[model samples]
Target chain A: FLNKAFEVALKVQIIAGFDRGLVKWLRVHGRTLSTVQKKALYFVNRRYMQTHWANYMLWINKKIDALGRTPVVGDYTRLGAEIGRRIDMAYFYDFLKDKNMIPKYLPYMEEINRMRPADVPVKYM
Target chain B: YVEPKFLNKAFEVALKVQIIAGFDRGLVKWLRVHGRTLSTVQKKALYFVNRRYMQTHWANYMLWINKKIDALGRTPVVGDYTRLGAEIGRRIDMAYFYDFLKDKNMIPKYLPYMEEINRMRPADVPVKYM
Candidate 1:
């Protein structure tokens, strides 16, 4: 139940946080919320608070939290990129699912190198 | 808000000065000079800005636009980006209450944060923050 809820709840929180962060970038004063954004922010927080899900923050906090366990920028970026990728994947999954198709047969590139040379490299064969 | 004509002037300067600005050096250099020696509080602020930058580029871009096409690039977020950009600008703006802190200087504090970002940000950037 927690895992399932987390999938939804974390999505909500992550989106809300992203929205709120963007809101901070716009005005001489941060712009006021619209009727809908306000609702999304509320639900996202409520769900995340209930789930205590903070994977990226957790990974960050782990190293930063320990007085001597500081991560270098590269390491921090390493962990940070994964956190962002997970969020991106979740959004993609939810969007695809909302259209009522399962992802089982959907093959997509996870990363560039994962690609084979289109039909094996000439050097190898 | 400056109308487009006035905005055009401000923007032109921002771009022109950007090229000439000695302060626009890379992150480590900029901070080593401006920050001189970062206090713990300043470091945290710097770190938080990176997180904010990440938030903007990541799932936040989707939330901002409310939706983007699967492969579209160079698009703005439309709603949430406007909202969040204004909000962050407000806080950064408030810091300029002191004389030494030009708003421009604080941005170096934020650029290091953009490392994880993979999407286009506002094309007419920093007009609000300035």
Candidate 2:
């Protein structure tokens, strides 16, 4: 079930980035991402699309002030708050999360999103 | 199309991209595969292969890739792997990954790799079920 959650998240995230510039970036550079960069990229570019650019500061705040940037093992899945947005920002991941196609992977990620969590878990397309 | 004979070739070209793209990121990537089964080793192989590509060429490839996305946004095709590969060229790092691959060898045997991955049962990704 946990794995399925990941799969659902993958599908939604994949779909969100699919056919978009990011996917192209991923295809070419997917192989190029150093693992940490890949995780960071995946966390934002792929996973939390709409808010990634915006909510980063909030996450940082929580990381430093609220969450304290505690060094933990494994994926955190928790996304924190929204910071700001560049005027020309393009975040398509919003559509997927709005539809509840994927989980935000962590708690604070919930705080940043404008979307409400789904009840039945997502039905992966 | 789905032959084990192609695995070696696939692995070879995949890693070459890492070497050229300089994804070593300060550390030489001497990958180890010690999974419980052959399937795990294969996944590990792919992980290393992709690691090389991402760390080394990601930045170079994203340039071109982002351009295409910036232009098209969505509605890009996932039809031929070549089209996908071509789209990949638009990215900064991916383009370099391509360079790395092409530098070592001709166009990678991508389709076969896809076929092999596709053949893996979704639930048994790290296990041999086929």
Candidate 3:
């Protein structure tokens, strides 16, 4: 129901910022990372991912409060898309790269360009 | 597109990163203040206990807010809500109202709520939620 849908919607929004190759790397070699590397990854994820997602959640919840209604699928999708468009995943990846934690097989510039801010409609609230 | 299971795994991983980081930071601060150390298992247990306590505290605070609003027979203006929150020693962030809004079905009436909150002045007495 709403709770499950909300969780899925949130996952969709968060995952949008993750690069496909990065996802592949984490899947394949995540557990093998050194303790220092894992800690660095945690910091970057917290900074670039969790913080922004928390803010986005607060923002949308405020919007939902103002609207005085439970959100529907369309509401989640539209509002989530609006916020998704604002994230700079390329910047996120660059930080990871600087830490030398990114996957070796990463396409570099092409992936960064792919992770650029999405173009989408505004004025969701 | 990533499979749903992968998405779920990613989300869980991201959430755990935040949780573990918070736990470590809090544990260090607590240890520094108390001049004590916790065993690894003890620290993990303490973190979960603290998290549960915080969640319960938040739920209780929301219920208290709901009761206050019920007494008023309407959603209080922002200032009034702030004063209400202050009375309970909880800082009133609009975000905190999310639970109350859901419980009372006030989500759609948010516009009026915002209007009143924006339009009203704070209570005469100095009050803060924190």
Candidate 4:
């Protein structure tokens, strides 16, 4: 039940984040959200996020694709690219920590142990 | 068709540039010296590779753009590649992924959208931090 809830809650955030990101961008750029814009936004966000998901899995699996430049440049790109993802995953860590204390989810949290980057300080994992 | 080796080489180089743009102050400096001499195909492939970086990393990409603007010494005015940050940012916020490889025209098909969005006059949108 906790796992299911976590999945649903995450789904909600993904949708909300995309909507907010898209709506804010359009409104800021001087056009009211049109039907076409809305459709385009939806399509883009879904695909983009899924690609990130795949990329995240790939990173975890250590299968990062080839680069388009020299080593130093490529290394910086690696650092830059991971910056937001790291920030995001860090936020999720906080979210799970707070939500896991429910006791019901405590055991499940232990089970999920959840995959996260090693650099993030878990304290009590 | 682009040779795999050429594509891979270009992709790596562009990836480094994009990544460095995210946080490093030196990417613009590097581009400053080498920006012009890149062959047309290299530039095109760089843009293509950038789309890959941009798709999942728009917010970070924005950070990179901010640095690029800083490095370039001006905010991109509406109607030019300068405004790509916002244009791509919008698409990213909405979650649409435009495939650069699918319809291989000379330039990215989405370039027009970027220009269009960039050209729009900025309206006051109150921002709040929570």
Residue A100 in candidate 3 has what lDDT? 37
Q: Where does model 1 exceed 4 Å of error?
A: A1-32, A50-125, B1-5, B9-118, B121-130
Q: Pick the candidate with the highest TM-score.
A: 3
Scored against the true structure, residue B15 in model 4 reaches a CA lDDT of: 38
lDDT string for model 1 (B35-113, tens) is 6555654544443343333233333333432343224565433343444434333333222221122222222222222
Candidate 3 residues B48-81, lDDT tens each? 3323223324445545656776798764565554
Docking quality category of candidate 2 according to DockQ thresholds: incorrect
Q: Once superposed on the true structure, which residue ranges of model 4 sit more than 4 Å away at CA?
A: A30-34, A55-125, B1-130
TM-score of 2: 0.19
Q: Rate the local accuracy (lDDT) of all candidates.
A: 0.34, 0.33, 0.41, 0.35
Give residue B71's error in model 3 in angstroms: 83
Tens digits of per-residue lDDT, candidate 4, B1-130, equal: 5332221333233433334233222323434554455455444433433333333343455455457656766544433333443344333321111122221211222333333322332221111111
CA lDDT of B17 in candidate 3? 38
Interface DockQ per candidate = 0.02, 0.02, 0.02, 0.02
For candidate 3, the TM-score is 0.29
| Model 1 lDDT per residue over A21-78, tens place | 4344322222454434333333332222223334444654665557575445445444
